[PDB]
C-alpha cells in the first residue's frame, strides 16, 4: 500500500433494529450497507459522513458517535481504503429512496449478512453492544477475506 483514501460509513439504530440501504450503483452495488462516501478537501470526516447520510437516505442526526476505524487492502491495488464508522441512536426526518440507495429497516434477527460485505457480520455484534473497535481486512476480489485483525478499544 502506497497511498490512502478516506471513506465514511453511518449506521442509524433504534431498539431492536438497524437502518440499511440497498446500493443501486457503483462500489459495492447489490450489497446492503450503511450510508457514506469520500471526504472532500475542506471537510472534516464527520462533516462528510453527515453529508452522505443526507444525500443517500434523506436523514440528518443531532448526536453522532464515532465507533470504528477499519482499513481495507485489496490484492492488486496500491491504495488503502481507510473507513471511519459512526453510529446514531436517534434521527431527524423520515428515510426515503435516492437514485443511489434504497433504505429499509431490519430487525436484528433479519439482518441480511449473506447480501452484505463479508466483514460486516464480524463487527456488527460490537456495534450493537455500543462498543468501539479497530480493524484491518485483506480481500482477494470482493468476496474472499485472506487476512483479518479486529480488536475492541476504549478510544479512537
Ligand atoms: C470492503 O468492505 C467494506 N465493508 C463495508 N461494510 N463497507 C464498505 C466496504 N468497502 C467500502 N465500504 C463503504 C464505504 C462507503 O460508505 C462506501 C463507498 O463510498 P461511495 O462509493 O458510495 O462513495 O462503501
Ligand atoms: Ca455513497
Ligand atoms: Ca455517491
Ligand atoms: Ca454524494
Ligand atoms: Cl457509480
Residue numbers in the entry: 1 to 156
Can you provide the manuscript's text about this entry?
MutT homologue 1 (MTH1) belongs to the NUDIX protein family and is known to be responsible for removal of oxidized purine nucleoside triphosphates from the nucleotide pool. We show that MutT homologue 1 (MTH1) efficiently catalyzes the hydrolysis of O6-methyl-dGTP with a catalytic efficiency similar to that for 8-oxo-dGTP. O6-methyl-dGTP activity is exclusive to MTH1 among human NUDIX proteins and conserved through evolution but not found in bacterial MutT. We present a high resolution crystal structure of human and zebrafish MTH1 in complex with O6-methyl-dGMP.
In order to study the binding mode of O6-methyl-dGTP and explain the high activity of MTH1 with O6-methyl-dGTP co-crystals of both human and zebrafish MTH1 with O6-methyl-dGTP were produced. Since zfMTH1 was crystallized in presence of high concentrations of Ca2+ it is likely that the presence of Ca2+ instead of Mg2+ in the crystal structure is due to the used crystallization conditions.
